[PDB]
Structures are given as structure tokens and as C-alpha cells.
Amino acid sequence: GKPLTEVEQKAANGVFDDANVQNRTLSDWDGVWQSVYPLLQSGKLDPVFQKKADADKTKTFAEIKDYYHKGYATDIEMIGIEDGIVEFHRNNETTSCKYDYDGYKILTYKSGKKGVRYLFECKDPESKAPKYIQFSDHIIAPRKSSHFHIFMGNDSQQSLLNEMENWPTYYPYQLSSEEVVEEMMSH
Ligand SMILES: [Zn+2]
Ligand SMILES: [Zn+2]
Ligand SMILES: [Zn+2]
Ligand SMILES: [Zn+2]
């Protein structure tokens, strides 16, 4: 929808000044989302890997697909976000919490690029949802997400900050596999 400003555009590419990063509310991720892992498991995402492989030298289709197989792997098939609550659908069962915002963390990847993770924490003893979750979606300022990676854990926020190999990814539930694929065939 909104035209990604020059900043938003470069930011979406890991290039930005820390002074341009701003807090974001949980509502930026409101909606019902589908994990893309089952799509990969059923070959629905092969075209995307084929394209990334016919452009990446030293990388074969299988090598690329193996990279994303590890990256997308998760048992949380669906996520629901609404009115401050995040709900996780695992095995026909669900868990949720009314998450508290804990600021963000600007990361500097070894590739030189930068990224921002938005941290939330569950402070409800009753709940059985992950204690710490972090959103990352190439957005550094208020703006509704179109899809996102989410890191979840029960050890600590720092702990989630070190994870760089597994990043469960989610797209709007209503999108078909074809639509999800076309979207990935861009950015
Ligand atoms: Zn700084
Ligand atoms: Zn469910
Ligand atoms: Zn990403
Ligand atoms: Zn996108």
C-alpha cells in the first residue's frame, strides 16, 4: 500500500541509520498468519528456490532448499494476533499471552547488513506461551507487516538474538500458495 520511502526501501535492504529506527506496536502484526513451512514441505515453494538458484553461483537448487528447510522449520503452523494477544497454533492445541513490549534491538549481521528485532515478553504465569518472542520483518518504523520472521524462546531475549539459522516465517492466512510465491519472487 504505502510507498516505501527511500529510507524504508534501503531499510528493507539492511541499510539504515540507527536514528531512523522507531518503536512499533504489536498491532503492526495483527491478523491471522500461516507458516510457510508446510508450503516448502509440499514443494509449493520450489519455484522460488529455482529462481534463487539460477542467479546464485556456487549454490544449487537443493543447497538453497536445504537452507530454507532449516530456516522455516517450525511446528507452529498458524499465528493469530489481535488486541494485544498473540496466539500460537501447534498440534490442534493453542497457547497465547497478552505480550508486553520490551523495545527493539538493532543487529549488525556479519554480512555487513543491519536488522531490527522487536521484542515482546509474556508476563502471565497462567499462560503456557513462549516467554520471549521477537519480530523481524525488514521494517524499522510503524507500518503494518506483510509477513514476518518470529523468534520464540523461554531462556532469554539475548538467547533469541544469537539465533541466525532458524527463523519461522509467516504470511497472511488468506493468501494462496501461488500468491505467497509471487510475493517472495520480489522485494
Ligand atoms: Zn546506535
Ligand atoms: Zn489452531
Ligand atoms: Zn527476511
Ligand atoms: Zn515482501
CB atoms within 10 A of CB 91: 8
For residue 52, what are the CA distances in angstroms to 10, 31, 58, 83?
21, 29, 11, 37
Residue 22 exposure: Cα atoms within 13 Å on the Cβ side: 9
Which residues touch 125 (CB under 8 Å, ≥6 apart)? none
Q: Are 36 and 48 in contact (CB under 8 A)?
A: no
Residue 126 exposure: Cα atoms within 13 Å on the Cβ side: 4
For residue 45, what are the CA distances in angstroms to 65, 68, 139, 155, 177?
9, 10, 24, 32, 8
Of 139, 104, 116, nearest to 29 by C-alpha is 139
Domain borders along the chain are: 1-187
Bridge partners of 87, per DSSP, are 80, 96
Q: Is the CA virtual torsion 143, 32, 73, 186 positive or negative?
A: negative
Report how far ligand 4's centroid is from the alpha carbon of 13 (Å). 11
Ligand (nearest to CA of 18):
1
Resolution of the experimentally solved model in angstroms = 2.2
Q: Are 16 and 157 in contact (CB under 8 A)?
A: no
Q: 1-187 architecture in CATH?
A: Beta Barrel (2.40)
CA 135, 69, 176: angle at the middle one, nearest 5?
70
Q: Is the CA virtual torsion 129, 155, 65, 118 positive or negative?
A: positive
Ligand (nearest to CA of 171):
4
Bridge partners of 98, per DSSP, are 85
Report how far ligand 3's centroid is from the alpha carbon of 138 (Å). 7
Distance CA 108, CA 26 (A): 23
